């Protein structure tokens, strides 16, 4: 909705900075950051990448912590896995807000998808070259 359309919810768009009522601009980033962490936190619960599932993968591969039992795998994973998804989703959402506000190429959003995937195949590229 950029013209002749309902403007209740809309991403900010302007050269430099646009500010008439912050009750619209600051709310957009709040809903964007919260949703991203909400989406990231729920994805691991369904994609089989939570702390509980990772330990089952490591148990299957016969990998253990140095001085912990098998049951303590989950607890050490829970120290980082659940909070990394919540904070990682928040950070990647914040990068989109920074990308959108700065007005980069690609209108900010979408380049985060591009930079990650090109990095995703980078790990293949480096390991296939000794």
């Amino acid at each position: 909705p950029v013209g002749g359309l309902c403007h209740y919810l809309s991403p900010p768009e302007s050269f430099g900075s646009v500010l008439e009522d912050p009750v619209h601009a600051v709310v957009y980033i709040v809903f964007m950051l919260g949703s991203c962490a909400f989406f990231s936190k729920t994805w691991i619960e369904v994609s089989g990448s939570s702390a509980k599932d990772v330990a089952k993968q490591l148990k299957e591969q016969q990998m253990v912590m140095r001085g912990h039992r098998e049951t303590s795998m989950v607890h050490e994973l829970n120290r980082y896995i659940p909070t990394a998804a919540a904070f990682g989703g928040l950070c990647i959402g914040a990068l989109s807000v920074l990308a959108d506000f700065l007005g980069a190429i690609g209108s900010g959003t979408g380049i985060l998808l591009a930079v990650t995937i090109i990095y995703q195949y980078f790990e293949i590229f480096v390991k296939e070259q000794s």
């Binding site: 912590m65 140095r66 001085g67 912990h68 039992r69 303590s72 607890h75 050490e76």
Partner: protein, 52 residues
């Protein structure tokens, strides 16, 4: 009985202390029991020098 008044020290310099603070704590123990002590007893588990 006189107190000693040496004409020269038998050692040129005092021996440097080698059990300093960095030599006292080698590394922290990171095990399940150590983590229990950290999160429940408010206790840090370290491996230290024997003479300390």
């Amino acid at each position: 009985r006189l107190r000693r008044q040496p004409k020269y020290p038998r050692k040129s310099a005092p021996r440097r202390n080698k059990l300093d603070h960095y030599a006292i704590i080698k590394f922290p123990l990171t095990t399940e029991s150590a983590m229990k002590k950290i999160e429940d007893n408010n206790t840090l588990v370290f491996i230290v020098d024997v003479k300390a």
